[PDB]
Amino acid sequence: ASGALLQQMNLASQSLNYELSFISINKQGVESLRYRHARLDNRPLAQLLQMDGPRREVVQRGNEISYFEPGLEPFTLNGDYIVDSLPSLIYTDFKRLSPYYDFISVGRTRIADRLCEVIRVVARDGTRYSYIVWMDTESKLPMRVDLLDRDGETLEQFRVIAFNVNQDISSSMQTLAKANLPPSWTPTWLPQGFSEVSRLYSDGLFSFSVNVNRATPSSTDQMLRTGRRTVSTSVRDNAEITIVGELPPQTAKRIAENIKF
Amino acid sequence: ASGALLQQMNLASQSLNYELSFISINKQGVESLRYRHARLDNRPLAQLLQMDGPRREVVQRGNEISYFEPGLEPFTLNGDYIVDSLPSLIYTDFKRLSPYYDFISVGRTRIADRLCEVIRVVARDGTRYSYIVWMDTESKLPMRVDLLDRDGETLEQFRVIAFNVNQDISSSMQTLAKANLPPFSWTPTWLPQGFSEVSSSRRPLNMPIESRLYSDGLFSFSVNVNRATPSSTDQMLRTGRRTVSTSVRDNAEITIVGELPPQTAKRIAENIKFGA
Known part of the structure; x- marks a missing residue:
């Protein structure tokens, strides 16, 4: 119904x-x-x-x-x-x-x-x-x-x-x-229903981007939430993984840590 | 205008x-x-x-x-x-x-x-x-x-x-x-200008509590006085418009209730005089 x-x-x-x-x-x-x-x-x-x-x-x-x-x-x-x-x-x-x-x-x-x-x-x-x-x-x-x-x-x-x-x-x-x-990188875990449209992802309702550059001395682990928008930054290996969009922090974090090089 | x-x-x-x-x-x-x-x-x-x-x-x-x-x-x-x-x-x-x-x-x-x-x-x-x-x-x-x-x-x-x-x-x-x-047995001896007494009651539940209601035509509050009990404490709570101010002086529990800033409710309480 x-x-x-x-x-x-x-x-x-x-x-x-x-x-x-x-x-x-x-x-x-x-x-x-x-x-x-x-x-x-x-x-x-x-x-x-x-x-x-x-x-x-x-x-x-x-x-x-x-x-x-x-x-x-x-x-x-x-x-x-x-x-x-x-x-x-x-x-x-x-x-x-x-x-x-x-x-x-x-x-x-x-x-x-x-x-x-x-x-x-x-x-x-x-x-x-x-x-x-x-x-x-x-x-x-x-x-x-x-x-x-x-x-x-x-x-x-x-x-x-x-x-x-x-x-x-x-x-x-x-x-x-x-x-x-x-x-040179793929996200290995995504929530069910998200597909690729930096890489932009949508499930038809919510969207987010996954961005990867080279890590600089200024790269920091951070988690900021403004309203709908979550910004997650994570430094692994020589990469700064940044996730931006309409995601709970816990799930943004999970996407980052499952990016495989 | x-x-x-x-x-x-x-x-x-x-x-x-x-x-x-x-x-x-x-x-x-x-x-x-x-x-x-x-x-x-x-x-x-x-x-x-x-x-x-x-x-x-x-x-x-x-x-x-x-x-x-x-x-x-x-x-x-x-x-x-x-x-x-x-x-x-x-x-x-x-x-x-x-x-x-x-x-x-x-x-x-x-x-x-x-x-x-x-x-x-x-x-x-x-x-x-x-x-x-x-x-x-x-x-x-x-x-x-x-x-x-x-x-x-x-x-x-x-x-x-x-x-x-x-x-x-x-x-x-x-x-x-x-x-x-x-x-x-008690007056409030300081009130902000323009406030006047609307009513007075005494009611039990069985210690008497004596209330006076005040209004300036816009804002209102009550001054309430009962005998102080072991449970009587000084407190100040504000909910929105409503302020509740409790103070214990002498053997009295003075409680002020209504549309008042905390500092002005406090000043009303400390200026209630008991006797004459």
């Missing part, structure tokens, strides 16, 4: 017309955001508005992502998503994940006065951070997403606050559509 | 029909709430809904507050507004405070995509916590409220996330209008 629900959430995020007022909670604080999404002529339309403070806005048409900020000059990049809108979990190909993750039904509750299916996303080998997701039972849109460290402490929370689904594409989305916008 | 704006925010919160989806942030976490307010026939109507988890709701019809919670039995109490609704600051008589507080204009910014006036509410004697308020420029409704300790760290935060003002009274506020709902 659970894996199919998660795929439906992915698809709903992409096909429905909707607006979410949400909050993004981390150790820096709580940020207020508004995300609008629509599909016109099989083309994705989106706006991410930042809701307090300076009027930072990012819009998507197709394929191009345009950035607006008072005083600064608007510019357009290529992208399939708006960075830091919905959590990256929502973009997952859950079918790819399914052999090496458990999707666990944890029951249901309300978020934003809407009944929600609650589902844990956990890697089977115990090597990774995990999610929980609360998804709207009716629309399947994500209502809350927690990223959890292995000790169960929350690293990131995303929380819808209010909440509407539209049948007909809204005025501002139609206006958006027509708008004038700016023109 | 800042004092006048704050009075207008007070009045707007009471007289307009509106809905606020908001969050309450403190050390415990972030809580999602929805607050609806209306005035029908010069009577306040309100609902506080709790937006995640179990469906707890509180309604106000005039002066009865009614509490609803699945599995439990609904009950109605008397009150002027829903507590832990809008911040208590919003109900202040800012005219009473004016000889003791500064109302300081700190500029303007956006909250919930609305332009807001930003105002600092500061006790002049440096004795109290302070607020900042972000108030909607058009409606004057409160958009954000920070309670700050004296070191400027925030103890509590109200923020609106969205935001609707109605000319007309809603369907649920009309349904609500017509619904079936349930029916001594």
